[PDB]
Amino acid sequence: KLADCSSKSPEECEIFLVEGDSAGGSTKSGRDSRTQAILPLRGKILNVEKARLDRILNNNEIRQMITAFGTGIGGDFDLAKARYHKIVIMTDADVDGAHIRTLLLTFFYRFMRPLIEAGYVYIAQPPTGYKGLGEMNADQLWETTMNPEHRALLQVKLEDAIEADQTFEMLMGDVVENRRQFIEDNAVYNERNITSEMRESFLDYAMSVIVARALPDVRDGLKPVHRRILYGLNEQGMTPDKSYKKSARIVGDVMGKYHPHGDSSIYEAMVRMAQDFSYRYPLVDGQGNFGSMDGDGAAAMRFTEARMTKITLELLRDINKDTIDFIDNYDGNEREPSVLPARFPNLLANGASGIAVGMATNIPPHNLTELINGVLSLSKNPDISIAELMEDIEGPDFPTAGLILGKSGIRRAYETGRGSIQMRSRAVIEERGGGRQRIVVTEIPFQVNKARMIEKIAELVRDKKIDGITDLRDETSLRTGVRVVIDVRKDANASVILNNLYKQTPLQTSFGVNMIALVNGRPKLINLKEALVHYLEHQKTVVRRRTQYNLRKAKDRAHILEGLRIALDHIDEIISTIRESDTDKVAMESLQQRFKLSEKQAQAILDMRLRRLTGLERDKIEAEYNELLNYISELEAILADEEVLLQLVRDELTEIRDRFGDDRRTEIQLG
Amino acid sequence: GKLADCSSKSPEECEIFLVEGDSAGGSTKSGRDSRTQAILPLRGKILNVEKARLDRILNNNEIRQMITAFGTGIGGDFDLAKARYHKIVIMTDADVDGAHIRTLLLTFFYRFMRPLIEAGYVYIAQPPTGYKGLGEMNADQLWETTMNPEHRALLQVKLEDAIEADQTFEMLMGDVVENRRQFIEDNAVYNERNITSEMRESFLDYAMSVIVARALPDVRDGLKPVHRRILYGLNEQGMTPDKSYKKSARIVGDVMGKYHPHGDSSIYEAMVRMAQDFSYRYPLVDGQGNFGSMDGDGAAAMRFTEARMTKITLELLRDINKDTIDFIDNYDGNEREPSVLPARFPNLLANGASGIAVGMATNIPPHNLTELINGVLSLSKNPDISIAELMEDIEGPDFPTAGLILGKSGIRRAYETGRGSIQMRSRAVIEERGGGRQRIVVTEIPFQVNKARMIEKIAELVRDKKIDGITDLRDETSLRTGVRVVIDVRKDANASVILNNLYKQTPLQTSFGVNMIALVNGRPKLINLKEALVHYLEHQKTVVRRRTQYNLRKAKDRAHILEGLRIALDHIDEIISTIRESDTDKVAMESLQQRFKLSEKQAQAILDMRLRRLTGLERDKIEAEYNELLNYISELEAILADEEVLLQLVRDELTEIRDRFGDDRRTEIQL
DNA sequence: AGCCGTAG
DNA sequence: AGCCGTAG
DNA sequence: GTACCTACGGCT
DNA sequence: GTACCTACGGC
Ligand SMILES: COc1ccc2nccc(CCN3CCC(NCc4ccc(Cl)cc4)CC3)c2n1
Ligand SMILES: [Cl-]
Ligand SMILES: [Mn+2]
Ligand SMILES: [Mn+2]
Ligand SMILES: [Mn+2]
Ligand SMILES: [Mn+2]
């Protein structure tokens, strides 16, 4: 992949390490091939602080860098053999580019420290704003980033080896906890010191993954990519009453407008939202191959089509009534929602799993009937205990059904945000003829790959680690649903075999609850009640702001109607005034002065079509004014009393529970 | 390998479904009856065994997986009693590409597993039409329509006549193009299945679709469907030169869903080529970012790049919304797309075309726009002009990459017959480099030659000692210098001999084989230069006539509305009275029609008039537009009244485009 | 172990 | 003999 | 994140 | 038409 320079004098040669083959090509065309070589890197590179030496030396990108530098590594390092006296790290001016910069400096620090000591390592400063370097023309890349006359290289300086050892170990090492402590301590929610570069670049990445990638918002239960998919469905009018739109149109629109990342991240997030084995309350309605419980992917996006589910309407309801704050998108050309109205408790209903930096999240899904009953109970008693809430919310409710063993993992998880919940397949023992039995499995645990669970059992049989199994078949079908059959040898105890299968395979699997979500923009480990309280506060805010919006808009409309009423009662004088006016401006001024009209009222009268002077329009306008004064009074009543507002939240939660509430699928059995 | 087997080990009742890939495979896996139905997904187009050598057939992954699956072995070692399925079901996608892959499969079975067909073990599934792949289908629809024994219609492949079948597989699938071409021209219309009938009908379906709807350009606008749909999508999304670049994914996503039911890479790569100044003599797309290089680097992935129309692409689209060209239904009946673009410059000859179809191909070189328009103008003044006279305007091809053409006799034969060989050469000079030594410096290479591959070939000849006298080889190409390839020559060696050897042994000399095939009245045709210009000029005459006819209808319709508004202004008191004394819009419309002798359209426009239209300035604006339209209408009538004025208007508009976009010749034609 | 799911 | 450009 | 199989025809 | 790389955390 190396595109070398022509000069064989290392003193004046430079090698640019660029994030992406997409940037590689721009930089190859734009470079000065006499003195500038290019080695493009395919995305995230090996973290050498976590990897053992066998994996480091077999890694394609590391090998290409070692061959290109020509110095060898560690103990066999020789600075005099360096093929370039400038090694230039040139990544995108975004958080993933900072991450790649931390990974490259970790490699140089641990295998090529004298390269840094000699002042041979530099960071390029490409201009900010742009997509990647792949969005830049060759000439822009040359003039801003690569051209000796104009560019600003940072030379990487090592000041203090002990501090640097400790920084690489803490930031990039296998011990998560010190990285988490660093993030919590530091997070605000010509030359470059390597320790400063590593701490600042890693913190930029960690914080961005925490607040803007991997973790859901407590209020609507969404990560940014899901929020942008649902918002795009909404803005393109992809409602349940409309036909399915081609997945590429949805994904293309979301990529350009809201989500400046790869198409696969968007499409696969949308596919999960459509799978009834992944989402307890699916958010997308898919037509075509949307994957299986066997880990089949969806068909490529050219094939599949999608729209909202009915319940997704409830995530988006009131978004256009100033219920939630809009923000600038990534390039300032669009607006997107910071959070959805979320008129049902989506965080807990659909759950969330994510790997961030310094932390992860693992929130199981729940029954919507149970959750809303819980919110209602909380709404009537701010002091309700977790144990009282568990009279409404028995425990998780998986889309895949199955069993939970006992209540003690559920209780610790609801109390602390952490606990181990044992999920068991639904299996029964049945006769199959001539005194023989089988185990039949019709439900498996949440997030278990059925085919992979079957291969694991087949492995135990083949390797003789389990006695008594004579055959193993997936008889799953559209007619039967999931059906895995394990034949038992005549006179073997099938109950012993089953208990052994639970021990030795994913037929029993734990759900490690770790309820981390964004609360006021910061990650926090939350308990069940804390999660319900933030949700209920969101609903109160949503319904208060919607009532405030409806009130402004109803007063604005009453104001226009007062103006139209004047105009129709005085139509001869209105028309005379307009006709005798040379311009809009003169007409506006004369109407305001003669009939006590506001600018907006005069504007509306000037915009009135001649058809609005028909006989029964005067009466249609009087009817609407009377209904609005009535409407205005109802809205004021709601805003005047926190109890009426709260009763309106309860009633709307109750309507959604009655329309979308369903039976529990997962059975909770005594442990 | 990829086989998902059935559970029954009794071949008599087992079926294997051959589907295109995992996108279809997944629907098929979810829908199947796993007791008796196995699925082997393929990997798209399979090896044509009638054209391939035996070593490549036996090492081909998909052929091996099918052989292993069937369990019968092949040719001489074939054993029907070892067959693992008594039904082998071809279930390709229902598109023409699905039919092609079916012809390739039947060719394989016929040549290597003939007894499989003789025994009645090969079947064709009939999945429903209007689905691009089975991945578009829900698993239940695939089961009920195509796979379910109770309802499906399988075709059993019958062999009736082995001699006829031998001759059919040889003609359709064998390496002799001419018999396949004769078959296409003879047959092209511009329970049980006989294998001969299936092969002829399915192959003809593919051949005709690739000829009329893929690989060959229309003589009128010079475009293939994928280019036309990219430019139309640029138009419909408002992606004009005055607007900012839109992300490539939005363009490609839109074109895929609405117009082009094929892979995203066929769309994006076609759009990339249209943006490269080394591929298109008059680039049709304006790209931002990495759009590839002369070294065969691709564009960056579509997330990284942005695009809009070039100014000259405005001239391809100009007047498309003035009923100049016939719209047709898109692939699914949900959208409209153009059959052809207005093409206000001679784009077929200007940008040229290369395409591989079935039974034929096309190879049309690009041309200088100034020369071509001069040629159209000369043709316009003399229908009887000779090829020789036209060559006073059009010297020969003009490549975006410049270089030299050797002599006029290939150009002449190609312009006279549609076929001829054009010898292209690099621009190479011999220059001194100091100390009595010389070098060859190449600053232009031939059209469609990969510069890096040309350099690797020279390096190969030096290393293998097949060329004497070369001491160094450098690409000194840069944005400042443009293309610069330096070949150092050994002291006292003849650099002119070395250059002539490079012309012999490398792409530094390369031929362009002209083969000017295009769609004429929807049928492929070998055309000469004059025929190409005649169809172009007839297109322009029709476009300008239809635009004048459209402008005239629309101007009369608009004058008719303005006559209505003028009456309303002249009698405004009576108009207002009439509307005010009407109960409803309907009654008002009727009374205006009766009282002022107005049409429905005129009454509706009066009813739609806003009160601000009654101000001085707005009254004057209605009078001013009526007067301008009467003048416009009179000019349009004068054009339609005289074919010479119409033709003079074509000439003047071609002349404007020549003056604005016409540029210097780049390729030198040497005698 | 290597899996879950958003990233390059 | 392998390249060119729309296709699976 | 990026790369390599396949068809097809006519030049070399 | 699709197959292999990477970070990141917790079990
Ligand atoms: C698939 O299997 C393999 C196997 C091997 C591969 N080796 C290298 C590179 C790729 C990826 C190529 N390809 C991905 C999808 C992109 N198009 C999506 C897209 C569609 C629509 C829209 Cl709007 C946006 C993006 C094109 C590039 C490999 N892929
Ligand atoms: Cl209007
Ligand atoms: Mn980036
Ligand atoms: Mn297909
Ligand atoms: Mn009159
Ligand atoms: Mn990816």
Residue numbers in the entry:
A (entry chain B): 417 to 545, 580 to 639, 1010 to 1491
B (entry chain D): 416 to 545, 580 to 639, 1010 to 1490
What does the original paper state about this entry?
The reason for this popularity is clear: DNA gyrase is an essential bacterial type II topoisomerase that is involved in the maintenance of the correct spatial DNA topology in bacteria. The A2B2 heterotetramer can accommodate a variety of inhibitors that prevent DNA gyrase function, namely, the catalytic inhibitors and cleavage-complex stabilizers. According to their mechanism of action, NBTIs are composed of the intercalating “left-hand side” (LHS) and the GyrA binding “right-hand side” (RHS) linked with an appropriate spacer. In contrast to fluoroquinolones, gepotidacin stabilizes only single-strand cleavage breaks, which is consistent with the LHS having an asymmetrical binding mode, i.e., it can bind in two conformations that are related by a 180° rotation within the same crystal.
Here we report the 2.3-Å resolution crystal structure of a potent compound in a complex with the S. aureus DNA gyrase core fusion and DNA. Significantly, this structure did not suffer from the static disorder seen previously, revealing an unambiguous picture of the relationship between the compound, the protein, and the DNA. The LHS (methoxy-naphthyridine) of compound 4 intercalates between DNA base pairs on the twofold axis of the complex, midway between the two DNA cleavage sites, and p-chlorophenyl RHS moiety sits in a pocket between the two GyrA subunits. In addition, the catalytic pockets display two different configurations. On one side, the single catalytic metal, in this case a manganese is coordinated by Asp508, Glu435, and the scissile phosphate, which is not bonded to the 3′-OH as the crystallized DNA is doubly nicked at the cleavage sites. Our conclusion is that the intercalation of the asymmetric LHS of compound 4 between the two central base pairs results in a rotation around the axis of the double helix of each base pair in the same direction, thus breaking the C2 symmetry. Consequently, the scissile phosphate is separated from the catalytic metal on one side only. When the DNA is uncleaved, this effect would presumably occur as well and only allows the scissile phosphate to get close to the catalytic metal on one side only, thus explaining why the compound stabilizes single-strand cleavage. In our case, one of the most interesting features of the crystal structure presented here is that the chlorine from compound 4 forms a symmetrical bifurcated halogen bond with the backbone carbonyls of both Ala68 residues, which is a consequence of the GyrA interface offering a completely symmetrical binding site.
